[PDB]
């Protein structure tokens, strides 16, 4: 006669959640077949003075509920000072941390922080390679994204990323254009190590939230050298191998890289209204760079469809759409060209952006988020991805970050955070007729969550491809 | 064809459950309704250095959706050392804070410390007195507790307990007698503040595990003062108001408390053993001692009844079982008199250990729960207390703290939590036929849990005249 929950986890198969908190300090595996916390760790009890816990994504494991490993990152500083908390702490920890946990089928256990074995410390996106055997992370504060050996923790290679404004003057800085340039990082310390950890290499104070391309103009973001900004955010993987493609805010570029050559080899352009492609000049050994004319609109979401044969990058704010490439000559990146823009009138203003997304295993739909500023109601968007069109929206509650996917391609598992301070959890919804199934508690301010991946194949829709 | 976990909540009512989180650093407020988490807060971001968020209760609100209030307390020092968790901390924060907290609809807000407001840091349990006009704390490692006004957080009285062993061996402390001293604890700061933050008064460094009586007879709790405990616990309310009781768990005595006369007037005998109480001498006006010719077993969770017709001990470890006296005769607690003893072959061991509880409105049963280390599975027990009888026990996971019940009397909702490193739940239990109904994810250590009470009625079945 009454209820059971015990029915709902029952259909949603064999799978473990992972999440990171933001404030809450606390990262969680929640097992979706019972409802149950496997395991959740503290920062703070490792003596983290800011824990901040920010982007993660899992490696794959032949059970997840006997062992994972995972990698989650944090931010610190003024980072601190973002949300409507009341924060005391006025001289926080710098952050940056990029810690490796394993879930030992009991707990969670604090391996080490990468950062201070690499000597790179970065804050944004966290992705694990297509061949699971390192990862990758961004960062919009110093402009760096590096890719990291899953035994050692040490940087394979890493880029920096610079803006030399058409005007120097910060509200005219991106929109009237700029050379970007790409250089190689390479390490100034002893024993292969960069000397990078923690704010070493910030150009802005704070990581650029929503709408902060706006900020930044307007001279309202302190550091040392935002004009010469661009705020990278990730660096995604081609499921096909070869490539990773890092993304570029303020620019509203992504530039493509060959990873076991460590050199760039295309530009991608995101506004509607440019070319497929900016020109890529080799300056040195180290250096390239690539002008663009003028930035009509700042980019977001980076990533590929599951089979390698679309690439998308989200415009945000000044445009809101999704920018599509034919990305099927896994050959030859440089002739990438755009067949697509996904358009709709559920981008209604400068709001809602869209800067996550999740495809189905069959790259026949994505589920991409709808983000807005409290309090009107956040969500997830449908998308068709043969005819690139949206099917459908949904209004779940505040603050709509992540999403990810069971393996079976039958449930979407996204988070909402609250904007730190307010209404927090994870939202279930049926991909067969795209209904919300309801949601579950979740006391934590998440930016990212994964499914734990089982094999390759499955990483290609989790952290991997995709933010 | 799809299972809306809505559907679950739909049954629930409309019931906000909150929890602290222990090691998580963190607190937060569930809307039972719906799934989602209200609100949530991590201690660090005010600059707590050692948030170990421990006891909690919350006052009546009229409408818990539009705002409520709270309380809960830290734990500090060598508490950060105890569990499984290879915490590296430095310079650890002393806790002992006595949090207030208002959640206004939206988000939770720091109100202030009452420690800081009263000077007296206390750690254990919060209870909320029966007119809503105040709260309750105890400590074990201070061997104080206090009651404390709404408005003002100042201390109405305080009470130190100490003991004298009359033989002066840890093994044989409390196994062999010794009297208790009762004394009135006044202030020494002005303004009426005492000077009793963070671990001053400590007599060990850690509040006593289950089965700690055994650490600290075996020299394996340091501290100054460890011959002198007794490990007060809580001060809990009859629900009839003028009496407060507060138990001791070394000594296995409770002592009853004239609230407004500010004396105590009974000690009440926890052990199968023992007589319904032990004599009260009057010493000086701000003294009493009681004389305990032997300490047969250590005691734990002490409470009344909804209706204040029956108070309950139980004791733990060397015995375990629910002793019962007869508490009809409100004006008179020397007169209250042994009726039942709850007793069980299941309860014969060490372990299980029963420290929490929860009545139905009627008084008719109660739930109570069943502890042991890892990795024996904990759970639940439901007691007919019409005639005293064990009715059921249900396994449900590691590690079961605190109960607490819808006030329709429909829905038992507990806490699991991981011995602070592993597997971490609430769980749903329905007392019409009592089925667990499932687990909701709840990442978090929790030590205590309770359902926003809406009346001074409620209460009798809230963080109030149990724990
Ligand atoms: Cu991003
Ligand atoms: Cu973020
Ligand atoms: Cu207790
Ligand atoms: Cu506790």
């Not at 490696?59 to 610190?76: A, I, L, M, R």
């Not at 309090?375 to 209004?395: M, Q, R």
């Not at 730190?420 to 949601?439: P, W």
Request: charged fraction near 20%; include cysteine.
């Amino acid at each position: 006669k009454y209820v059971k929950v015990q029915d709902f986890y029952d259909q949603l198969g064999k799978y473990v959640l992972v999440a990171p908190g933001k404030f809450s300090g606390t990262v969680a595996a929640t097992d979706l077949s019972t409802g149950w916390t496997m395991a959740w760790l503290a920062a703070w009890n490792y003596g983290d003075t800011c824990p901040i816990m920010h982007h993660m994504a899992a490696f794959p494991s032949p059970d997840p509920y006997k062992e994972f490993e995972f990698v989650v990152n944090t931010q610190g500083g003024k980072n601190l000072f973002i949300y409507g908390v009341p924060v005391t702490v006025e001289d926080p920890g710098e952050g940056m941390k990029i810690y490796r946990i394993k879930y030992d089928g009991t707990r969670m256990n604090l391996q080490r922080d990468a950062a201070e074995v690499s000597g790179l410390g970065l804050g944004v996106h966290v992705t694990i390679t297509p061949e699971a055997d390192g990862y990758a992370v961004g960062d919009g504060q110093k402009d760096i994204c590096a890719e990291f050996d899953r035994e050692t923790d040490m940087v394979r290679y890493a880029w920096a990323f610079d803006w030399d404004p058409n005007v120097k003057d910060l509200k005219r800085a991106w929109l009237d254009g700029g050379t970007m340039t790409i250089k190689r990082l390479k390490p100034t310390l002893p024993g292969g190590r960069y000397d990078l950890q923690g704010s070493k290499g910030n150009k802005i104070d704070w990581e650029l939230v929503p709408g902060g391309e706006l900020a930044i103009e307007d001279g309202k973001v302190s550091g040392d050298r935002p004009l010469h900004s661009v705020a990278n955010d990730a660096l995604v993987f081609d499921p096909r191998g070869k490539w990773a493609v890092a993304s570029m805010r303020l620019p509203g570029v992504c530039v493509v890289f060959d990873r076991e050559n460590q050199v760039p080899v295309a530009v991608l352009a995101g506004p509607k209204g440019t070319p497929s492609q900016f020109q890529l000049v080799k300056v040195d050994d180290d250096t390239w760079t690539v002008d663009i004319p003028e930035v009509i609109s700042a980019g977001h979401q980076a990533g590929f469809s599951p089979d390698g044969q679309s690439f998308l990058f989200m415009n945000s704010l000044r445009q809101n759409n999704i920018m599509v490439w034919d990305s099927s000559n896994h050959d030859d990146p440089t002739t990438w060209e755009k067949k697509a823009v996904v358009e709709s009138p559920d981008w209604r203003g400068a709001y809602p952006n869209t800067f996550h997304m999740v495809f189905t295993p069959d790259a026949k739909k994505i589920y991409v988020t709808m983000w807005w500023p409290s309090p009107t109601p956040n969500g997830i968007a449908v998308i068709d991805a043969v005819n690139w069109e949206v099917l459908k929206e949904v209004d779940l509650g505040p603050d709509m970050h992540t999403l990810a996917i069971t393996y079976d391609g039958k449930f979407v598992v996204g988070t909402l955070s609250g904007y730190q301070n307010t209404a927090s959890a994870i939202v279930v919804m049926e991909t067969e007729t795209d209904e919300v199934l309801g949601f579950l508690p979740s006391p934590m301010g998440h930016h990212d969550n994964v499914i734990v991946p089982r094999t390759l194949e499955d990483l290609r829709i989790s952290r991997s491809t995709t933010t």
